[PDB]
Each structure stands twice: as structure tokens, then as C-alpha cells.
Amino acid sequence: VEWSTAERSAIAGLWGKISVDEIGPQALSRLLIVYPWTQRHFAAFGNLSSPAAINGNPKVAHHGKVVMGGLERAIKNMDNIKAAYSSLSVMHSEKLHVDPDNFRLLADCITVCVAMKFGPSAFTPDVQEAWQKFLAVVVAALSRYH
Amino acid sequence: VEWSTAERSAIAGLWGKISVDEIGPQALSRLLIVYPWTQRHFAAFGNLSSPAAINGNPKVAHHGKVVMGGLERAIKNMDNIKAAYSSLSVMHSEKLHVDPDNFRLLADCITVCVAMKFGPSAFTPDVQEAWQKFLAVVVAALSRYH
Amino acid sequence: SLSDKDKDSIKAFWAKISPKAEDIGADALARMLTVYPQTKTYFSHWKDLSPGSAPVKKHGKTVMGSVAEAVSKIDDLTNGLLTLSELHAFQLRVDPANFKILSHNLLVVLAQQFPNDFTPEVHVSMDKFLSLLSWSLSEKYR
Amino acid sequence: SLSDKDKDSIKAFWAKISPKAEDIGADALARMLTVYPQTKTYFSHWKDLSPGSAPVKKHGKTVMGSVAEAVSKIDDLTNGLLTLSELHAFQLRVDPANFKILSHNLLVVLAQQFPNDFTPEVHVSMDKFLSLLSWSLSEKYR
Ligand code: HEM
Ligand code: HEM
Numbered sequence: 001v002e003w004s005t006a007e008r009s010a011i012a013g014l015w016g017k018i019s020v021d022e023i024g025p026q027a028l029s030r031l032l033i034v035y036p037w038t039q040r041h042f043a044a045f046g047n048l049s050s051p052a053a054i055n056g057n058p059k060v061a062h063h064g065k066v067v068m069g070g071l072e073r074a075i076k077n078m079d080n081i082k083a084a085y086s087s088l089s090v091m092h093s094e095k096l097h098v099d100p101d102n103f104r105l106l107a108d109c110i111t112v113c114v115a116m117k118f119g120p121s122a123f124t125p126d127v128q129e130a131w132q133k134f135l136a137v138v139v140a141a142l143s144r145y146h
Numbered sequence: 147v148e149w150s151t152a153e154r155s156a157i158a159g160l161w162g163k164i165s166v167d168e169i170g171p172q173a174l175s176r177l178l179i180v181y182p183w184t185q186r187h188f189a190a191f192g193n194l195s196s197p198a199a200i201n202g203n204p205k206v207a208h209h210g211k212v213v214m215g216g217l218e219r220a221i222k223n224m225d226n227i228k229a230a231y232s233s234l235s236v237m238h239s240e241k242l243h244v245d246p247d248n249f250r251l252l253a254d255c256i257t258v259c260v261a262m263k264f265g266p267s268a269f270t271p272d273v274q275e276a277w278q279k280f281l282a283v284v285v286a287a288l289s290r291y292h
Numbered sequence: 293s294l295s296d297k298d299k300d301s302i303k304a305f306w307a308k309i310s311p312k313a314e315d316i317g318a319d320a321l322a323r324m325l326t327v328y329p330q331t332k333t334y335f336s337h338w339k340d341l342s343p344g345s346a347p348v349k350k351h352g353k354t355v356m357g358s359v360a361e362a363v364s365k366i367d368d369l370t371n372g373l374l375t376l377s378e379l380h381a382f383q384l385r386v387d388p389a390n391f392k393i394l395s396h397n398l399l400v401v402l403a404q405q406f407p408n409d410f411t412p413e414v415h416v417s418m419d420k421f422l423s424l425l426s427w428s429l430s431e432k433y434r
Numbered sequence: 435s436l437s438d439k440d441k442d443s444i445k446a447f448w449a450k451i452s453p454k455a456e457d458i459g460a461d462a463l464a465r466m467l468t469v470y471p472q473t474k475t476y477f478s479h480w481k482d483l484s485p486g487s488a489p490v491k492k493h494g495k496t497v498m499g500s501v502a503e504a505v506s507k508i509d510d511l512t513n514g515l516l517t518l519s520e521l522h523a524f525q526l527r528v529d530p531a532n533f534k535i536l537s538h539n540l541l542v543v544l545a546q547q548f549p550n551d552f553t554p555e556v557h558v559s560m561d562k563f564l565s566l567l568s569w570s571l572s573e574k575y576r
């Protein structure tokens with residue numbers, strides 16, 4: 001995949017401002033609230049019985065951080081993302097059988113929480129553009145390797 | 147992708163009984179009629195305006211044979227399908243901007259046609275399994291390559 | 293949403309199709325399980341998941357008898373299906389993605405067993421019918 | 435799909451946002467166009483696809499205008515939207531998949547603008563509103 005130097009720096013400035021401790025738990029909570037079938041993949045977690053329980057759940061939070069850590073791994077390897085994710089792909093394909101449409105749903109909830117935090121002046125169309133190309137590489141790479 | 151020999155053999159043996167004339171024009175027609183919006187990519191083909199027009203359309207028929215022609219290429223290249231579909235992928239997703247969901251719909255139209263031709267004896271769950279895996283690779287390889 | 297022309301095609305097709313409805317259900321469920329193994333996790337508590345096994349045959353007649361009622365009740369799919377929305381969408385938290393995998397295996401099986409009758413035009417109406425049913429099963433998700 | 439809580443929650447939401455409806459329409463539309471450049475193929479007769487351009491501001495205002503009508507007829511979407519559905523299926527023949535894309539850009543912009551007010555619970559109700567909206571837009575395709 002080719003990045004523009006505009007993309008590269010857009011991605012890097014945005015990631016640079018993300019508080020992983022904040023967005024992570026928030027994005028995972030929003031997926032389990034907005035797409036609650038997704039709770040069945042995490043029923044080792046608690047206590048997903050209501051929005052409140054989701055937001056107070058330490059494993060949800062921890063795991064939202066761990067998701068941002070998957071993203072940070074794609075950040076540092078932007079030219080070879082597919083390879084960085086190869087184990088992740090196997091674990092989400094061959095082991096969890098997470099239907100791929102879900103990775104799209106999480107990426108969308110991530111975007112939503114980024115947008116909400118940065119507002120119109122920082123979450124620019126051109127920034128969204130490059131963020132989205134990035135998440136589409138990630139999702140692809142998560143996402144069965146044929 | 148690694149194909150068991152069970153899968154290779156299930157795939158070559160299915161393929162070897164396909165009447166491409168026949169399965170081709172059926173698949174595409176069924177596609178244009180069951181997922182009508184897809185008619186938009188095929189405005190070169192004329193009329194189009196009803197079920198009988200669609201499969202009374204000589205160009206549909208002829209393009210359905212071309213689709214089966216693409217599937218063959220993948221048959222002869224199943225250890226490296228992506229490399230084989232490289233320019234197909236560019237064409238469909240750089241240049242026609244067909245949404246990827248359409249590749250699955252066509253693939254599903256094909257599977258129904260082939261199941262209709264062959265019957266239970268024939269198109270056993272195991273054969274469908276390896277056929278499915280074949281279409282899924284074809285479909286991923288037709289999509290934007292990252 | 294179903295037009296009056298859809299109900300007719302479906303009521304009609306069902307009248308043709310309904311003697312073999314146990315086997316449509318058996319064949320559909322067990323092709324789902326083997327062709328899309330991601331679905332096997334929902335039925336892990338069954339003894340056997342292989343095609344043709346006893347739990348597969350028994351559960352397929354169940355799917356199809358519920359599909360039977362929805363056809364009987366095709367003007368009011370909602371009330372008709374709600375029972376099953378709560379089951380699937382609330383209790384089992386079934387991924388809505390699998391609804392279309394099932395309806396697809398359904399179509400493949402119907403066309404496989406009744407090629408005669410499964411015109412693209414019957415197919416559009418059955419497909420629409422199955423999505424309505426999916427949409428109806430989707431109600432108690434959230 | 436829409437429940438009495440979704441109705442209240444989206445109606446109340448509409449009243450807050452919506453001074454800014456045209457803003458949202460142009461911010462959502464222009465984002466869809468650059469972020470998802472495959473939706474560009476439908477508007478390539480315009481002058482002027484970029485974020486903020488006049489054709490986007492003008493077409494943004496319309497989109498959000500018919501989403502207002504849709505919210506006033508929220509108990510009968512199925513009626514409010516059917517004419518837009520004939521136009522989208524039949525004269526424009528928009529791939530149904532694109533609707534999901536606009537509606538995502540639209541949740542993005544709400545919420546980028548009202549972070550404030552876009553709880554996960556409001557997000558649920560808005561998102562169900564807009565699948566209903568796509569679902570009614572799909573009525574006329576086949
Ligand atoms: C952008 C998409 C995603 C990324 C980058 C991501 C990343 C990760 C990471 C880094 C881990 C920890 C791996 C380890 O323990 O070695 C993980 C595990 C996990 N993932 Fe995801 N993930 C994504 C999406 C999803 C989605 C959409 C689901 C389905 C709802 C899901 C379900 C899970 C589950 C259940 C675990 C295991 C939790 C546990 O056993 O402790 N993931 N993922
Ligand atoms: C099963 C997956 C598919 C395969 C194997 C396939 C294969 C092909 C092939 C072999 C060609 C001729 C390309 C050439 O000139 O070398 C073609 C052309 C084309 N394809 Fe597909 N295709 C698939 C799906 C689709 C879908 C879903 C659409 C759009 C709804 C589509 C739209 C087109 C169009 C518009 C052309 C050129 C037609 C013309 O001659 O004007 N294809 N495809």
C-alpha cells in the first residue's frame with residue numbers, strides 16, 4: 001500500500017494526540033453498547049449487562065487499551081501492516097471466528113470517538129481520509145489471509 | 147492459501163463438469179435480476195429493464211461466459227490466485243469501483259446455479275465447502291489489494 | 293419490504309416446497325455448519341454437528357416449521373417472529389451476519405432440490421422474504 | 435425496529451442539532467466523497483466534489499432536509515421515503531451498500547459536532563434510525 005507524506009503525517013499527528021487510555025476503553029464500550037451481539041465474543045469479561053456496567057468494567061477498559069496497542073503496532077509498521085498482523089488475523093479468523101464485519105464496526109466506533117474528541121478543526125476531512133485508509137488496511141489485515 | 151488435496155480434487159472435479167456456456171449466462175442473469183442495482187455497471191449491455199429482457203439479452207449471456215472465463219483463470223492458478231487477478235482487481239476496484247459486496251453476490255448466484263445443475267449427490271456439503279473457499283479467494287483477490 | 297407480488301410467489305413456492313421442508317432444513321443447517329464453521333460455536337452443546345446427524349435433522353425441521361409459520365403469517369412478520377427475536381438477538385446474541393449465511397444456504401438448498409421452480413424471479417421474492425425475516429429477528433438486538 | 439425510546443431519543447436529538455442540519459449535510463457528504471472516493475462516481479457531473487464546495491453545500495442541505503421530513507414522519511417512514519426510494523433505485527440506481535457509508539459519515543459528523551450530546555445510548559437510537567432509513571430507501575430496488 002502506498003501512503004502519501006500528507007497521510008503519514010496526518011496519521012502520525014492524530015495518533016500523537018490520542019490518549020490510548022481514554023479512546024481505547026471508550027471505543028470498546030461503544031461497540032458493545034451499539035453493536036451488542038459483539039458482547040458474546042467477550043463473555044469472559046463480566047458484566048456487560050448495561051451501559052454503566054460496560055463503562056465500569058476493568059477488562060473492557062484494559063482491553064480497549066490493548067486494541068489501541070494493535071493500532072500502534074500498525075503505526076510503527078505502516079508499509080508492512082499485513083505481516084505485522086499475521087498472528088492477529090489467525091487469532092481473529094481461525095480461532096475466535098469474529099465475522100470481519102465486526103472489525104469494520106470497531107474501526108467505526110474508534111473513528112466516532114476520535115471525531116468526538118478532536119472536533120471539526122482537528123478532525124478534518126483530509127485527516128479522516130487518511131485515518132480511514134489506515135483503518136481499512138488494518139481491518140483488511142485482520143481479516144482472513146488467503 | 148493452502149488447499150488440502152481433498153479441496154483441490156473437490157474443486158477440479160466440480161469445475162470439470164461445469165458447462166460454462168450455460169452456468170455463465172444463468173449466473174449473471176440471476177445476478178442482474180436478484181441484485182438489480184448491479185445493472186448500473188452493465189449499462190453497455192442495453193436492455194435490462196425486466197427479467198425476460200435480461201436473460202433475453204445476448205450480451206449478458208456473453209459476459210456470463212467471460213465471468214466463467216475469469217473463474218477458470220483462478221482454477222489454473224489456484225496456488226497464486228491473487229497474482230493471477232492482479233489486473234482484474236485493478237479493473238474492478240480501481241476503475242469500475244464495483245462495491246466488494248457485489249463480488250460475493252455474483253459468487254453466490256454462481257453457487258446457486260451450480261447447485262441447481264448438480265443436485266445433492268453431486269453438490270455435497272464437502273464439495274460446497276471447498277467451492278465456497280474457492281469463491282472466497284477469488285472474491286478477496288478481486289477486491290482492492292493492500 | 294414484501295410487495296403483494298412477493299407474498300404470492302412465496303405462498304406459491306411454499307405450497308410446492310413444503311413436503312420436503314424437513315430435508316430443506318436439514319440440508320441448509322448442516323451445510324451452514326460445515327461450509328461456514330464460524331457458525332458451529334452456537335451449537336457446540338449438540339452431540340453431533342455433522343450433516344445428516346440427528347440434532348441437525350431435528351433442528352432443521354424446527355427452523356423450517358418456523359419459516360412455515362412466517363409464511364402463514366407473512367402480512368405481519370413481526371408478530372409471528374418476536375418470540376424468536378428475543379431468543380436469537382437477546383439471549384444467544386447471534387451475530388446478524390449469520391442470518392444471511394443461513395438464508396443463503398436455504399436458497400442454495402431450495403434451488404438444488406427444486407431447480408425446476410427456482411427462477412431468478414422466485415429467488416428475488418424468497419431472498420426478500422428471508423431478509424424480512426432477518427430484519428424481524430433483529431428487533432431485540434438493541 | 436424503532437421503539438418508542440428510539441423515537442423520543444432521536445426526536446429530541448433532532449431538535450438540538452438542526453439549527454445545524456445543513457452544516458451536518460455538507461460536512462457528512464463531503465467527507466463521504468473524499469473518504470470513500472467510490473461514492474464520487476455518482477456525482478461526477480458536478481463541478482466541484484471537494485469538502486465545502488457549493489455543489490456539496492447545496493446537496494448536503496437537501497439530504498438533511500429529507501432526513502428532517504423522515505424524522506417528522508418517523509412513525510411512518512415507510513410512507514415518507516418511498517418516492518426517494520423509487521428515485522434512488524430506479525433513476526439513480528445507487529448501490530444499496532453506499533447508504534451505510536453516508537449514514538456512518540453522518541454519525542461521524544453528529545457528535546464530531548455534538549460530543550456533548552452523543553452518548554452511546556443516543557448513538558444506538560440514531561444508528562437504528564438510519565438503518566431504518568436505509569431499509570425504507572431499499573424498498574423499491576427489487
Ligand atoms: C480494529 C480491530 C481490532 C484490533 C486491532 C484488535 C486487536 C486485538 C489485540 C491486540 C488483542 C490481544 C491479543 C493477545 O492477547 O495476544 C485482541 C484480542 C481479542 N479480540 Fe480483538 N482486535 C480488533 C477487533 C476485534 C473485534 C471487532 C472483535 C469482535 C467483537 C474482537 C475480539 C477479540 C477478543 C474476544 C480478544 C480476546 C480477549 C481475551 O481473551 O482476553 N476484536 N485483539
Ligand atoms: C465472480 C467475480 C467476478 C469475476 C471473475 C469477474 C470477471 C470479469 C472478467 C474476466 C471481465 C472481462 C475483463 C477483461 O476484459 O479482461 C470482467 C469485466 C467486467 N466486469 Fe466482472 N467479474 C466478477 C464480478 C463482477 C461484478 C460483481 C461486477 C459489477 C456489478 C462486474 C463488472 C464488470 C464490468 C462492468 C466489466 C466490463 C464489461 C464490458 O465488457 O463492458 N464484475 N469481469
Ligand code: HEM
Pocket residue numbers: 331334335351354355356358359376379380384386390391392394425426
Ligand atoms: C430464518 C433465520 C433463523 C430462523 C427461522 C430460526 C428459527 C428458529 C427456531 C424456531 C428456533 C427454536 C428455538 C427454541 O425454541 O429453542 C431456533 C433456535 C436456535 N437458533 Fe435459530 N433460527 C434462525 C437463525 C439462526 C442462526 C443464523 C443461528 C446461529 C448461527 C441460530 C442459532 C440458534 C440456536 C443456538 C438455537 C438454540 C438451538 C437449541 O439449543 O436447540 N439461529 N431458531
Ligand code: HEM
Pocket residue numbers: 473474476477479496497500501518522526528532533534535536537567
Ligand atoms: C440517507 C440517505 C439519502 C437521502 C435521504 C437522500 C436524499 C436525496 C435527495 C433528497 C435527493 C434530491 C431529490 C430531488 O432532486 O428531488 C437525492 C439525490 C441523489 N442522491 Fe441521494 N440520498 C441519500 C443517499 C445517497 C447515497 C448513499 C448516494 C450515493 C453515493 C446517493 C446518490 C445520489 C445522487 C447521485 C443524487 C442526484 C444528485 C443529482 O441531482 O445529480 N444518495 N438524494
